[PDB]
Design a protein around this ligand. Sequence first.
Ligand SMILES: [Mg+2]
Ligand SMILES: [Mg+2]
Ligand SMILES: [Mg+2]
Ligand SMILES: [Mg+2]
Ligand SMILES: [Mg+2]
Ligand SMILES: [Mg+2]
Ligand SMILES: [Mg+2]
Ligand SMILES: [Mg+2]
Ligand SMILES: [Mg+2]
Ligand SMILES: [Mg+2]
Ligand SMILES: [Mg+2]
Ligand SMILES: [Mg+2]
Ligand SMILES: [Mg+2]
Ligand SMILES: [Mg+2]
Ligand SMILES: [Mg+2]
Ligand SMILES: [Mg+2]
Ligand SMILES: [Mg+2]
Ligand SMILES: [Mg+2]
Ligand SMILES: [Mg+2]
Ligand SMILES: [Mg+2]
Ligand SMILES: [Mg+2]
Ligand SMILES: [Mg+2]
Ligand SMILES: [Mg+2]
Ligand SMILES: [Mg+2]
Ligand SMILES: [Mg+2]
Ligand SMILES: [Mg+2]
Ligand SMILES: [Mg+2]
Ligand SMILES: [Mg+2]
Lengths: 185, 172, 222, 58, 159, 51, 127
Amino acid sequence: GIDHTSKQHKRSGHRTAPKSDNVYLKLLVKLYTFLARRTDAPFNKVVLKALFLSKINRPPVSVSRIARALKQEGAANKTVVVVGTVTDDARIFEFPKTTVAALRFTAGARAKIVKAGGECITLDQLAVRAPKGQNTLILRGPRNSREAVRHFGMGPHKGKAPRILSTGRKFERARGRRRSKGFKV
Amino acid sequence: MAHFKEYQVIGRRLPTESVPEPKLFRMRIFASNEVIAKSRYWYFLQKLHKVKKASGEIVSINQINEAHPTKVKNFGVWVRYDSRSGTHNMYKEIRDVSRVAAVETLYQDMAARHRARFRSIHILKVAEIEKTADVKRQYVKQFLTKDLKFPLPHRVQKSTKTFSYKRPSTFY
Amino acid sequence: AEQVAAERAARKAANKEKRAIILERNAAYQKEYETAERNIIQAKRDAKAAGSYYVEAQHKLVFVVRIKGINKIPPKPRKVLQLLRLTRINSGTFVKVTKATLELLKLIEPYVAYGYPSYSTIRQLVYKRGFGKINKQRVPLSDNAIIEANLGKYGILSIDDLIHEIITVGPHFKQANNFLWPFKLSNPSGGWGVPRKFKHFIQGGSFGNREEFINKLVKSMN
Amino acid sequence: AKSKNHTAHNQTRKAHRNGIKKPKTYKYPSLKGVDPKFRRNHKHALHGTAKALAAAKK
Amino acid sequence: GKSHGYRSRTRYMFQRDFRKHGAVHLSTYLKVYKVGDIVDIKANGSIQKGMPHKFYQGKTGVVYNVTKSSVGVIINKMVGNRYLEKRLNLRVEHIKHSKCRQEFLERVKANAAKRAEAKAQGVAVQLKRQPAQPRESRIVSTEGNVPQTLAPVPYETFI
Amino acid sequence: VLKKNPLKNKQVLLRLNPYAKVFAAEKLGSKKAEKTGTKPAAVFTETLKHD
Amino acid sequence: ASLPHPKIVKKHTKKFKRHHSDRYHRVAENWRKQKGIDSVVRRRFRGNISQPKIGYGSNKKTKFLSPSGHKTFLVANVKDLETLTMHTKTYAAEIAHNISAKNRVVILARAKALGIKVTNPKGRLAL
RNA sequence: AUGCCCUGACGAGUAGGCAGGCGUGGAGGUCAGUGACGAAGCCUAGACCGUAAGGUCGGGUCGAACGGCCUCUAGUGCAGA
RNA sequence: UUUUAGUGGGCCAUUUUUGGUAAGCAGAACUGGCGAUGCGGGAUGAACCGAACGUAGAGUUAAGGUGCCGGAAUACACGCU
Ligand SMILES: [Mg+2]
Ligand SMILES: [Mg+2]
Ligand SMILES: [Mg+2]
Ligand SMILES: [Mg+2]
Ligand SMILES: [Mg+2]
Ligand SMILES: [Mg+2]
Ligand SMILES: [Mg+2]
Ligand SMILES: [Mg+2]
Ligand SMILES: [Mg+2]
Ligand SMILES: [Mg+2]
Ligand SMILES: [Mg+2]
Ligand SMILES: [Mg+2]
Ligand SMILES: [Mg+2]
Ligand SMILES: [Mg+2]
Ligand SMILES: [Mg+2]
Ligand SMILES: [Mg+2]
Ligand SMILES: [Mg+2]
Ligand SMILES: [Mg+2]
Ligand SMILES: [Mg+2]
Ligand SMILES: [Mg+2]
Ligand SMILES: [Mg+2]
Ligand SMILES: [Mg+2]
Ligand SMILES: [Mg+2]
Ligand SMILES: [Mg+2]
Ligand SMILES: [Mg+2]
Ligand SMILES: [Mg+2]
Ligand SMILES: [Mg+2]
Ligand SMILES: [Mg+2]
């Protein structure tokens, strides 16, 4: 017998492959498994991991988020890399010429990039023209802006958006919400 | 305890800055190995002095042999022990050729006759009785007469065979 | 023109100076163990001549064998045994003796036999049972190149370097001792002595401090 | 029925199966609980530090 | 029924330390507490306002807030299977500085000082503390100190 | 694939530790000690044989 | 014949019979795990039957092999036999239980012509 | 290439969780699948594979249909009530 | 970080405990167990001792033993009855 100090046969808790049975996404994982094994650049290990990520763990990156990262100092000529979907933004009125390498581009975000002289690039074209992640810039979308994260940790004195179906008067704005009706939270 | 060994143990009570060279206490310890003899050292000095092993130091442990291991000696063993209902002093006489082989008999005798264990017994003193007629006990004064000889009746011979063929004899 | 033979000439050259280094450092250790024991023997003889008492240097290394199994252990000695990497019965570890370890030993005293290991038992344990922790992965030592790959930054290049850092508690004892995966010893070959193990050695069992009689017991377990 | 009222037997085994955490301190604590006079000035003592930093770099 | 009030079971703890009753001596009110100072909480029973609850007697914590007569002290309290940050508003006469932190801060000034002449020469000055190492060789003399003790004593009742 | 034990198997005794050849050559493990003629003090043996 | 292989060790050749299948006719010998809370089988009391567990699993070098050294492939017709032309040292044909007697003639003729061991070349032979 | 291989450690378990599989009825595809020269069923201290769920084969009985695989679906697995 | 199952009848032992003459009693504290757990020993036993479990082989042990059942000394030694 062994005085164990740790839970035996513990899995890592990390995806080692995508749950998706997408045939082309397995090809990209196959491409970047080879790169992360054989290149020793840290970009390919981050990218291959982010190919495994689930749909809420790959939030969309807007083109206004792409443009705001190109306003960074000396980052105008880098290659924006989004392991996920690139979406439009009509809130921005000027978009810079740049190279964006994403999985998917929406039909508006492809329009706003190629109208400004840019190029929308698949990640296998990125690995051809930048196999070590040369001059690249990974952008990630906001995870905690999801409508489901608001209801996480709902409790007393937390301010965390009750799981509700009905909104307005008569729906959870009474005893437990004001010092008049009963108590306050 | 296959055979007891006598040790001298010398201990010190660790030097302080007020007292360098402390006073060097020595005991004569009957024990099996040196581990027990040092343990028996600190157990006895803790009954005599404000010292313990955490504040003291063993400076010498030496095994004392018997000077004449092939000479028959009458010993007088002074012993204090705990019974089931009190503590008693005791004087016993053992005739033997070693001090460490008289202490074997004493620990055997006090266990057999008084049910006294090793942990109950303090050996106050082993001394060799130098002169005959200073021997007190009669069970050892038996074996000190002139020209003593005795038979050994009823000899029982061990066998290695499970069967005998002769109906054996006990002559000797 | 892949050019193997010059590289094989270079590698077989580099192995030869590396064994030359190991050979002279083992000769350096062999002389220093011999003079150290000769000095201690002569120091006792000199003090006895000069009416004095040579008091030895107190022991700087113990070897701790866990002699008790897993169940029914109180929470405090259970945690100390895990911090000494004695996680199963008959496991062994060398422990540098300080006050911070002399109080760990008093906590786990009715579960372990410890005592002072000699050069011979340190040499035999590391030769026969010596394993390395390399990507945790328990590598048997079996070659000096996998000691130098992991302890060369402390200047330990052979197995006899590793014994030397254990018997002489060097400045990199901690890195050399934690490199050694805890010794997975057998049961003792002539038994334990002692009809009952779980009394103290002083009263006639096995546990606790048996100061130099750890060498009889561990060589029986080896 | 008569029932065993209360015991804290097995309560420290459960308390250590998931490993008691110290509360994970941070640089820059919250200024909740501070003397409001001190916090009120500290808004200005750090606003002007940023003005004297941002103008001096540009 | 059962009683679980605020000063329950505080009979000896809030007591006033024999022949030291009376007023609080003025060094308590002249001590200076800054934010980040590490203080020992010991309630003075003769001051009933700003008095800590019985859980915090003997606990040690860090000053976070300073008001007119009171420090704000942060204590870690084990609640179930985790520790929770407890923020206590205690007047400064239940509070003294922890003398360990004065002993630490001098060692910081010492280790800065000892590393200075490590920079004059002889790098790696070995400034870490070490435990009580085992003793070295000795040679115990016997001049005037011949080894003597007798045997164990017999049994006497000596009433 | 298979751990061989030095203290058996002289080949692996020589793979590790090239001094093992020299130790067996000069015999080094049964080496003599010089015969010095120190005698103890009078007070040592008197204290040893003390009652 | 077949490829060289190590000696096939089975580790448990005995059938794993259900508890009390010998005792009641309604309990089949098909293995069922005793999920009783009192069950001396489930608690592994000494004297009781063995339970299937993954330690009894066959060595993967010799797993699925017949004692002839082949993996059995079940063959219905001549076309299914001819997927084994190259693998005559790893696979043996077993003609299915529902093949006609005249169709079993034609399969055995091609397997002789191809060199395939057929493990049941005696079903539906008029002898 | 949820392949092939190297290395190390580990293996108790009720309630309970999850994973990988076995089996049943019906559906889409496929094997130009099996079949009156005998489908399915049933019996067989005959054989084989799988740790197992089970799968396979031989023999006897029998007489009209029924399987493998990739998927879909459920009135889908019994010793107890 | 999210989400979710079962549980929310307990019981024993060492030590310190309250009540009770006492309890295989009624109640607490700390730990270790049982429940949920087989294995070797205590003849037998939920809780004791030893030790926790994949399938095997070889060695060595633990606690307990070694007249015979029954593997192992009708061993050695000093006494006592
Ligand atoms: Mg033997
Ligand atoms: Mg209850
Ligand atoms: Mg009260
Ligand atoms: Mg079988
Ligand atoms: Mg079976
Ligand atoms: Mg069944
Ligand atoms: Mg039960
Ligand atoms: Mg399991
Ligand atoms: Mg399965
Ligand atoms: Mg179907
Ligand atoms: Mg047909
Ligand atoms: Mg039929
Ligand atoms: Mg039948
Ligand atoms: Mg019909
Ligand atoms: Mg149904
Ligand atoms: Mg059933
Ligand atoms: Mg039925
Ligand atoms: Mg049932
Ligand atoms: Mg409830
Ligand atoms: Mg209930
Ligand atoms: Mg009472
Ligand atoms: Mg049970
Ligand atoms: Mg027992
Ligand atoms: Mg039992
Ligand atoms: Mg009994
Ligand atoms: Mg018996
Ligand atoms: Mg085997
Ligand atoms: Mg027998």
